[PDB]
Amino acid sequence: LPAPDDTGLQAVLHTALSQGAPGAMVRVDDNGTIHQLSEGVADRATGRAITTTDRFRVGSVTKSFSAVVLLQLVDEGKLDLDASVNTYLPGLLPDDRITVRQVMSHRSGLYDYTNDMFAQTVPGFESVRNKVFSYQDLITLSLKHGVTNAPGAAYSYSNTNFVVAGMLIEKLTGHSVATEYQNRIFTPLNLTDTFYVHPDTVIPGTHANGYLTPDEAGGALVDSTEQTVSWAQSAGAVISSTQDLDTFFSALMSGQLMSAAQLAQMQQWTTVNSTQGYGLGLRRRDLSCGISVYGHTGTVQGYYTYAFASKDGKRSVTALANTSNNVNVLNTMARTLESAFCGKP
Ligand SMILES: C[C@@H](NC(=O)CCCC[C@H](NC(=O)C[NH3+])C(=O)[O-])C(=O)O
């Protein structure tokens, strides 16, 4: 790989601040040599500086943790990716032909209930932030809508898919998703900054606060740090750090978290766009210099995450900006992957 470009990373973070991120940071684990940069504030009201050890909400990076648990259950003979969801969760979906593989790759057609919840950014956040939902509650909210396409037919990202994922984990194991994440992933990899505390609203330890950008241009930011994330759960509620997401995606890609067979299934790409694929709870992004990287993005209120590793896991990068609903910042933070994997122009 090219050398990571720290001057480029510095410029990405500085641009993100200029576009409304209170703080932005990145950590690269380059085959045992660390790069770490941060700019701005973890708490914009107290002025406390952001750092690469601050914990944060990783949003949809949680889908990869859910997918790893499910794929270990496939290795254990407890789950068949081509069986119907309703085989394990009887009566759950209106179509008994929607399969586990289709849910995990967003080809199921299930409508994403979060498009109803967040049609208005700040009112929607205020509506869900202190709610506790069951898994079934969120499925029922999706099922009020029809499906959007035939099973397996079309990629359509939907949080509903990884609500089904959490239901499958709990039904087939008899344990909570927190217990399964802890025993299968967090403890074996010693991810000491990684937690699943739903429905608790506190982020353990020193953390970046999240700042939700309102829909009104120029409007005051909303502190969105403390919320249940119950509207996402196994689709979005993990808390972690840049070092722990680097360790997780490096372990995944280097073959430490499941059989080779199941990692290959995880990397069967469905097209997302001309430079992106989606596997089983896993994203592929194709970078300008002809390198592809593997991992997941996250976007929970107040936090944008990118966590991606090279194909063999030897270089991993995690970047965080503590705002959301700010597409300038989201697009800018993606450039950390270019600087960290493609290096200087
Ligand atoms: C899938 C992933 N997150 C979401 O689905 C966030 C959707 C609302 C984000 C919100 N945007 C809006 O409210 C748009 N009106 C924002 O940018 O914070 C997860 O569950 O981890």
Bond before 199 cis per omega within 30 degrees = yes
Give me the residue spans of the domains in the chain.
Answer: 1-345
Burial class (CB in 10 A: 0-12, 13-18, 19+), 240: buried
Residue of minimum CA distance from atom 11 in ligand 1: 325
- The pick from 118, 209, 223, 328 for probing ligand 1's pocket by mutation, whose C-beta has the most ligand atoms within 8 angstroms, reads 118
Tokens of 22: 């209170």
Side by side, the strands of the sheet bearing 304-309 are 33-40, 23-30, 315-321, 304-309, 292-298, 283-286, 276-278, 270-273
Q: What amino acid occupies position 318?
A: T
Question: How far apart are the CA of 114 and the centre of ligand 1, in A?
Answer: 7
CB 76 within 8 A of CB 175: no
Q: Resolution reached, in Å?
A: 1.2
- Look up 288 and say whether it is catalytic: no
CB 241 within 8 A of CB 55: yes
Question: What is the rounded distance in angstroms from the CA atom of residue 114 to the CA atom of residue 257?
Answer: 30
Q: What amino acid occupies position 131?
A: K
Question: What is the rounded distance in angstroms from the CA atom of residue 64 to the CA atom of residue 52?
Answer: 21
Residue of minimum CA distance from atom 1 in ligand 1: 60
Q: Which fold has domain 1-345?
A: Beta-lactamase (3.40.710)
Binding site listing for substrate: 118-121, 157-159, 283, 297-299, 324-325
Question: What is the rounded distance in angstroms from the CA atom of residue 235 to the CA atom of residue 138?
Answer: 11
Burial class (CB in 10 A: 0-12, 13-18, 19+), 219: exposed
CB-based contacts of 38, cutoff 8 Å, min separation 6: 13, 23, 24, 25, 26, 49, 50, 51, 52
Report phi then psi at 14, rounded to 5: -65, -40
User: Which experiment gave this structure?
Assistant: X-ray
For the CA of 157, the closest atom of ligand 1 is 1
SS3 letters across the chain: CCCCCHHHHHHHHHHHHHCCCCEEEEEEEECCEEEEEEEEECCCCCCCECCCCCEEECHHHHHHHHHHHHHHHHHCCCCCCCCEHHHHCCCCCCCCCCEHHHHHCCCCCCCCCHHHHCCCHHHHHHHHCCCCCCHHHHHHHHHCCCCCCCCCCCCCCCHHHHHHHHHHHHHHHCCCHHHHHHHHHHCCCCCCCCECCCCCCCCCCCECCCEECCCCCCCCCEECCCCCCCCCHHHCCCEECHHHHHHHHHHHHCCCCCCHHHHHHHCCCEEEECCEEECCCCEEEECCCCCEEEEEEECCCCCEEEEEECCCCCEEEEEEECEECCHHHHHHHHHHHHHHHHCCC
Tokens of 323: 């705002």
For the CA of 232, the closest atom of ligand 1 is 20
Residue 293's CB: how many other CB atoms inside 10 A? 24
